[PDB]
Amino acid sequence: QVQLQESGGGLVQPGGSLRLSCAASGRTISRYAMSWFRQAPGKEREFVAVARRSGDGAFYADSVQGRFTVSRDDAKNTVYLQMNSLKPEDTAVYYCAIDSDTFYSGSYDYWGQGTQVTVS
Amino acid sequence: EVQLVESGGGLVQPGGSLRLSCAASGFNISSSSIHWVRQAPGKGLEWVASISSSYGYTSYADSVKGRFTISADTSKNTAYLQMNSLRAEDTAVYYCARSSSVYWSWWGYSAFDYWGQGTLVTVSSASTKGPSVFPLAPSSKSTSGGTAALGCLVKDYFPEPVTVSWNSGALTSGVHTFPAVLQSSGLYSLSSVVTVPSSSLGTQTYICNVNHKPSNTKVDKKVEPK
Amino acid sequence: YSQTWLASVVIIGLLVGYINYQHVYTLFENDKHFSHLADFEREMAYRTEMGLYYSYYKTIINAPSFLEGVQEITHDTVTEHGHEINTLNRFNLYPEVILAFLYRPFRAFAKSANWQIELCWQVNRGELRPVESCEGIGNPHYFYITGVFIVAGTVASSIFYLGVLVSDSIFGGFLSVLCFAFNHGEATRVQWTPPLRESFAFPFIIGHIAILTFVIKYKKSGHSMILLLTSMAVPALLFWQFTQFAFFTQICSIFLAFSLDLIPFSTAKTVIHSHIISFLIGFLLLFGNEMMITALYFPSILALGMIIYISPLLSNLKFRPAYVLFLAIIFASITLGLKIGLSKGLGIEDDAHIFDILRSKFTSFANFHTRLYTCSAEFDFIQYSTIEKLCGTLLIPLALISLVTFVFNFVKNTNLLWRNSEEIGENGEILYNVVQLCCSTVMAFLIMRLKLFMTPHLCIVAALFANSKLSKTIRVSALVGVIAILFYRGIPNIRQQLNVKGEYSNPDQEMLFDWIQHNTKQDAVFAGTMPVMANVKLTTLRPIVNHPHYEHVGIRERTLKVYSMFSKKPIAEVHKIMKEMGVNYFVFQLMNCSNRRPECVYRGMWDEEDPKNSGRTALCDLWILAANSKDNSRIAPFKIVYNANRNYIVLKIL
Amino acid sequence: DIQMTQSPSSLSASVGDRVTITCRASQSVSSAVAWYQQKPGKAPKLLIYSASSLYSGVPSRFSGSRSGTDFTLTISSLQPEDFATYYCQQGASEPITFGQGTKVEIKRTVAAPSVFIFPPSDSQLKSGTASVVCLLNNFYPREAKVQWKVDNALQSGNSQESVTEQDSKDSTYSLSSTLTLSKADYEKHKVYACEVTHQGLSSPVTKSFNR
C-alpha cells in the first residue's frame, strides 16, 4: 500500500551538478523514515544515505561523506538530493528506499525503478 | 571545603533490610535539606525521599512510601536512610544530594548542587559462586581466511565484577568486553571476543584468564580455531 | 431535564417562602392578639425598643406631607430633650421612612377609589371602657407588620436556594428548609418582636450570602454581578448597624478562601468592587456617619483589596504555608493599623460597647454600663438548653457529620504544602460557607441573639449531606431515611410552637397613661427607666430625656444620671441633677427597688462604682416607704404625684 | 503527579555543532527547573538552575532558555569532553521528578556491521543445555536489529542481548546475541539461523549453520 517515484535524469557529465528528487504517493513521510541506496554492476546493494524524521542527523556512506545534500519537504512529501563535483565513479542506479519499521532498524521493502545515472 | 560521603551499600537478600549513611564535611547540617536519588542500569534518575533537619520534616515518594525511613541528626552532621522489605527492583546506585531547607523553600527547592558519589545496593535470592569459562571459535563455513573472532565466555557466576584477559594482555586489537546480563535464575554471564587477524587465526592456542575476587577464581581457559 | 429542574427549583423556593410568611403571621396573631386590640393597645404591645421604632413611622404617617415628616425626624428635638439629634442615621430608621412613603399614597388613593381596605367595629372589654379594634391592610399597624413579614418570609427561600447551591441537588435544599422549620424557634423571633432592626436586615444579609455563593460557585464576574451584590448589600447596611460586623465576618471568610486558590482573580475583584460601592453608598445615605469609619468593615475592605491586587506579584511562590502566613499577616496588620490609625489617631473615637461586654466576660471589668447588658440574659453566654434543643432535632450531629466529611475530602483532594497559582482548587463556595459557619458559631456562643446567624448556617451545612460528588438507589433510599427521621423529631417542635398563646395584657400601664394624658401639659419632660420611656413617647407624645437605644454616645451618661435615683446619693444631689436635666416627672416601678443574685439589682450595681456612698440609706429604701406611708415627708423636695396599687410611681420634680 | 516529557531521547551531532535539548512539564511550574549532566560511572553535577542562571565552574558554553512551561538547554560549540547524558528536573512540588534522560553522541562515518556465528563448544553437550550465539561488531548508528529463528520459528522471550559501550577507536559498537536451549531442546531441527537487519543495509544479513 506504499509506492514512490523518482524524477530527473539525463546523461550527466563529470564536474557538473545534479538535483535528484523522490516523492511517495499514497503514504506520508512525517511518521516514516527514509534512505538512499545505490545499485551498480559488480557491486550493487550498497548503502548511501539515511534520515529519519526531521533532521536529527543524516548518515552518509563512507566514500561520499559530505558530497551529498539532502533536503526534505513534508508538505510535498518529497526528497531533493543536491550533487556537486561529480567524479566519474557514479555510474549506477539511485534508489529512494522506504523502511516500514518505526524502530529505524532497516526493514526496506520497496525498491522501484529509481534513477539511472551514467557518467561518460 | 564542604563535601558529601556515603556508605552502607553492598549485597543483601530480598525481603531483608539495610541502613545506609550520608555524612557531610564543612557546612553544618540542619541548615539545609538532603535528598536520596536512585539510578538503575539503563534507567533515569528518580528522587526517593527528603529530610529537613531544622525541625524534622520528612517526605517520601509514593513508590517507596511506608517502607523507607529517613532520620537525619545534626550533632554528627550525618543522615540515615533505613529501608525494609526489599523488593526486586531496589537494586540500584543511591546518591545523597543536597537542597535548600523546606521551611525556606519559598519558590521551590534549590537545585541539587553538591551531589554525593553514591553507593550500589543489590538484592538477589541466589548465593554467590564462581564462573564457568567456555571457548568460542568461528565456524569454518563463513569468513574463512579473512576476518575471524575468538571468544571466551564466563557463565553462571556472582557478583558482577569478573574481568577476563587474553594472553597476559598481549592481545589488544579489537578486544571487546560485554556487560553481564541478569537472567531469570539470578546469575550473571558475559563474554569477551577479539577480531583475531589472518594467517589461521594467528596459529596460536589462545589463553583467557578470568579474575573474580569474591570467589578468588583465576581459571585459564584455552580457545583454538575449529 | 435542565429547564424542568431549574423551574421546579424556583417554584418550590417561592412556595416555601409563602409558607414561612403564613407561619410567622399565625404565630404573631397567637402571641399579641391584634385582632381584638385597640390602636392604642397595639402600641402598648410593642415593649422597650420597638415602641421607639414604631413612633417615628407614626410621626411620618401623620405629618401634613412626607417631606415635612422626614424633616421632623431629621431635626428631632423630643427624643432627647436638651439637644437636636438626627434620628434617621442614628437609630437606623430607613425601614420606617420607606414604609411610610409607601403607606401615605396608598391610603390617599384608597379614599379616591372608595375601596373599604379597612374594616372594623365596636369591641367591648368589660370592666374597662369600650374600645375600637380595627382590621385591614389600610390599618397602619397591619401595613407595617405586613411589610415586615413579607420581608421576613424570604429567609426560607434564601435558605432553600443556599441548600440547592452548596449540594447541587434538590434533596439538599429540602434538608436545609426542613432543618430550618423544625428549629424555627431558635432561628428567628420576628413573630415575638416584629419592629426590631434584625427583622428588617437579616433577610437581606442571607440574600447577599446566597448571591455571593452563586457568584463563587460559577465563577461569575462583570457589572451585572456588582449590581446584584450591591442591591442586597445597601439595604442591609442602611438597616441594622450591626450588619457591618456581619459583613466583616464574610470578608474574613472570603480571604481564607482566596488564600487557598479557590477563587479566581476576576471574581474576587468583582466581589471587592461590590463591597466598595456598597460601603460608599451606605456611608453617603447615612449622612456621613463617623461611626461607619473606624468600624471593622472599612479597614477590612481596604486590606482585602490590597491583598487581592498584590496577588499576581506572588505567582511564583510555591510553599503554600509561607504564602498563607504572609497574606494573613498582611490582612491582620493592615486592618488593625487602619482601625487604630483612625480611632486613637485622628480622634474619631467610635462607640466601643461591643468590646466592653467581651472584656467583662473574661476579665473582671465591671463598668455599670456593661452590667446593664450582661445581666440582660440576651448578652449572656449561650445556654445548655439551646444546645440540647438543637441536638434534639439532630441538627448538630447532621451538620457535624457533613463538616467532617468536607474536611476529609478537602484534605485528600489537594496538595497542602505546594501550590500552583494557575490552577483553581474547586469547591470554594462550600469552604466559604463552612468558615462563615465557624465565625457565626463563635459569635452565637459568646453573645446569645447572634444565634440568628448560627442556626441557618447550621441548616446550610447540614444540607451538604446530599452532595453527590462527596449508587443512585442506595443514595436516594438513604436520603429519604434521613428526611423521615428528621420528621419524626421535628413535628413535635412545630406543634408545640403553634400551641402557645400569650398572656392577656395588664391594666396598670393604661391607667398610668390615661393619668399622663389628663393631668400633665403637652410639653412636660419625662424621665424614668428605659422600657417605660419608649412607651411614654410612643403614645402620650411627651418629650423625654432617656430612651432604650442606649448604644451610641450622647445618651450613655444621661442614663447614668437618671438611674442615680436608685443609688445611695443624697436627696438634694439627685434633685439638683433632675432639675439641671430639666425633667418634670420621674416614672418608675417598685419592682425596680427590690433587694440572692447581687450585681444585677440597682442597689448593688451602685456599690461597684460608688463605694464612697455605701453605708448611707438607699434612695429606694426611701421611695418604698414614701409610697407606703402615703406622705411625702422624708423626701422634702420630692412629691409622689401618682401612686396606684403600688406598681407605678410618678414623682414630680419641684 | 508532576512529570516531564522529553522528545529528543537520543541526539547525535558532530563536535562544534549547535545542539538544543527541550523539556516540557505537564503542569505549569514557573521557573523551578534545572539541568544536570551525568557521565557513565560518575555522579551527576549541576549545570543550570532557575532555567537561565548558569552555575559556577561549569563552562560558559551551556545556555538555558525558558518560554512558559517549555525549557531548552543549548550548546553552541559541542566539544569532546561534553559527551554525557543530560537530565531535566523540577523542584516546585513535593514529588521531585527528573526527565527521561537524553544522550549526546558523536557523528561518524557509518559502516556496515560484521557478524559471525558461533555454535556451542564441546563443554555444552554434558551440562544439559547449549547456546548458539552471534557476535556482531563495527557498525553505526546505535539502532539495529538481531533475530533468531530455527527453521522459520519466530522467537519471543528467550533471546539474550549484550551491548558494548561506544568504542574509543572508531566510535562503533559491538553486540552479542544468545539463544540458549536445553538438552531436550538441543537435538531438534539441525538448521540454526541468525538474522540481522540494520538501517544501513537493505537486505537482511543471515548467518546459518547445520547441526
mmCIF file of C-alpha atoms in Angstrom, chain A residues 17-114:
data_model
loop_
_atom_site.group_PDB
_atom_site.id
_atom_site.type_symbol
_atom_site.label_atom_id
_atom_site.label_comp_id
_atom_site.label_asym_id
_atom_site.label_seq_id
_atom_site.Cartn_x
_atom_site.Cartn_y
_atom_site.Cartn_z
ATOM 1 C CA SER A 17 25.806 19.416 -10.517
ATOM 2 C CA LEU A 18 22.686 17.271 -10.115
ATOM 3 C CA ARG A 19 19.278 17.679 -8.445
ATOM 4 C CA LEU A 20 17.504 14.353 -7.896
ATOM 5 C CA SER A 21 14.054 14.023 -6.330
ATOM 6 C CA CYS A 22 11.944 11.191 -4.922
ATOM 7 C CA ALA A 23 8.306 11.513 -3.868
ATOM 8 C CA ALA A 24 5.967 8.986 -2.268
ATOM 9 C CA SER A 25 2.343 8.523 -3.331
ATOM 10 C CA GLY A 26 -0.410 7.205 -1.074
ATOM 11 C CA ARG A 27 1.609 7.384 2.158
ATOM 12 C CA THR A 28 3.131 10.204 4.190
ATOM 13 C CA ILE A 29 6.688 10.701 5.460
ATOM 14 C CA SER A 30 6.228 12.553 8.771
ATOM 15 C CA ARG A 31 5.957 9.250 10.668
ATOM 16 C CA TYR A 32 8.198 7.044 8.497
ATOM 17 C CA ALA A 33 11.942 7.251 7.814
ATOM 18 C CA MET A 34 13.816 7.420 4.521
ATOM 19 C CA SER A 35 17.041 6.296 2.885
ATOM 20 C CA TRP A 36 19.008 6.474 -0.357
ATOM 21 C CA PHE A 37 20.744 3.443 -1.884
ATOM 22 C CA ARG A 38 22.959 2.715 -4.888
ATOM 23 C CA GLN A 39 22.854 -0.232 -7.296
ATOM 24 C CA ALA A 40 25.853 -0.807 -9.555
ATOM 25 C CA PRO A 41 27.036 -3.744 -11.674
ATOM 26 C CA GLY A 42 29.662 -5.824 -9.900
ATOM 27 C CA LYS A 43 28.975 -4.156 -6.531
ATOM 28 C CA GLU A 44 25.279 -3.410 -6.017
ATOM 29 C CA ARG A 45 23.171 -3.199 -2.837
ATOM 30 C CA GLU A 46 25.445 -0.511 -1.375
ATOM 31 C CA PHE A 47 24.355 1.889 1.358
ATOM 32 C CA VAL A 48 24.302 5.591 0.506
ATOM 33 C CA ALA A 49 22.347 7.703 2.988
ATOM 34 C CA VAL A 50 19.604 7.709 5.611
ATOM 35 C CA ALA A 51 17.485 10.252 7.507
ATOM 36 C CA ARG A 52 14.639 9.533 9.900
ATOM 37 C CA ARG A 53 12.066 12.181 10.685
ATOM 38 C CA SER A 54 13.164 15.832 10.803
ATOM 39 C CA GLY A 55 16.955 16.190 10.623
ATOM 40 C CA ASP A 56 18.147 14.794 13.955
ATOM 41 C CA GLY A 57 21.170 13.555 11.992
ATOM 42 C CA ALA A 58 21.660 12.313 8.434
ATOM 43 C CA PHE A 59 24.072 9.454 7.809
ATOM 44 C CA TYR A 60 26.159 9.103 4.649
ATOM 45 C CA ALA A 61 28.257 6.366 3.084
ATOM 46 C CA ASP A 62 31.983 6.385 3.784
ATOM 47 C CA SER A 63 33.201 7.460 0.333
ATOM 48 C CA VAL A 64 30.546 10.180 -0.144
ATOM 49 C CA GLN A 65 30.815 11.914 3.242
ATOM 50 C CA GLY A 66 29.652 15.489 2.659
ATOM 51 C CA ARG A 67 29.271 15.359 -1.135
ATOM 52 C CA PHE A 68 25.513 14.705 -0.906
ATOM 53 C CA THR A 69 22.911 17.276 0.131
ATOM 54 C CA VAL A 70 19.513 16.023 1.327
ATOM 55 C CA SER A 71 16.509 18.325 1.731
ATOM 56 C CA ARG A 72 13.046 17.259 2.876
ATOM 57 C CA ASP A 73 9.559 18.641 2.189
ATOM 58 C CA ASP A 74 6.968 17.032 4.458
ATOM 59 C CA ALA A 75 4.152 19.137 2.982
ATOM 60 C CA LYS A 76 5.084 17.941 -0.514
ATOM 61 C CA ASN A 77 6.377 14.614 0.892
ATOM 62 C CA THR A 78 9.432 14.954 -1.344
ATOM 63 C CA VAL A 79 13.195 14.497 -1.014
ATOM 64 C CA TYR A 80 15.710 16.536 -3.015
ATOM 65 C CA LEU A 81 19.336 15.466 -3.487
ATOM 66 C CA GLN A 82 21.994 18.004 -4.470
ATOM 67 C CA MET A 83 25.184 16.847 -6.190
ATOM 68 C CA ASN A 84 28.408 18.746 -6.881
ATOM 69 C CA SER A 85 31.925 17.860 -8.077
ATOM 70 C CA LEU A 86 30.750 14.572 -9.559
ATOM 71 C CA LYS A 87 33.563 12.054 -10.011
ATOM 72 C CA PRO A 88 33.330 9.530 -12.886
ATOM 73 C CA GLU A 89 32.716 6.680 -10.384
ATOM 74 C CA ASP A 90 28.991 7.468 -10.002
ATOM 75 C CA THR A 91 27.626 5.202 -12.768
ATOM 76 C CA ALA A 92 24.769 3.379 -11.032
ATOM 77 C CA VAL A 93 21.049 3.453 -10.226
ATOM 78 C CA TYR A 94 19.905 5.631 -7.323
ATOM 79 C CA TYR A 95 17.045 4.247 -5.223
ATOM 80 C CA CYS A 96 14.793 6.145 -2.817
ATOM 81 C CA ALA A 97 14.142 3.495 -0.161
ATOM 82 C CA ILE A 98 11.386 3.352 2.461
ATOM 83 C CA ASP A 99 11.580 1.400 5.721
ATOM 84 C CA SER A 100 8.318 0.253 7.299
ATOM 85 C CA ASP A 101 9.783 -0.162 10.806
ATOM 86 C CA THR A 102 9.454 2.782 13.184
ATOM 87 C CA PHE A 103 12.468 1.456 15.118
ATOM 88 C CA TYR A 104 14.637 2.588 12.164
ATOM 89 C CA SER A 105 16.164 -0.903 12.113
ATOM 90 C CA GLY A 106 16.195 -1.096 8.309
ATOM 91 C CA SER A 107 13.182 -3.049 7.035
ATOM 92 C CA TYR A 108 13.391 -1.833 3.439
ATOM 93 C CA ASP A 109 10.803 -3.492 1.190
ATOM 94 C CA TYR A 110 10.060 -1.071 -1.683
ATOM 95 C CA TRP A 111 12.635 -0.535 -4.437
ATOM 96 C CA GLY A 112 11.019 0.874 -7.571
ATOM 97 C CA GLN A 113 12.886 1.789 -10.728
ATOM 98 C CA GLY A 114 14.988 4.604 -9.270
#
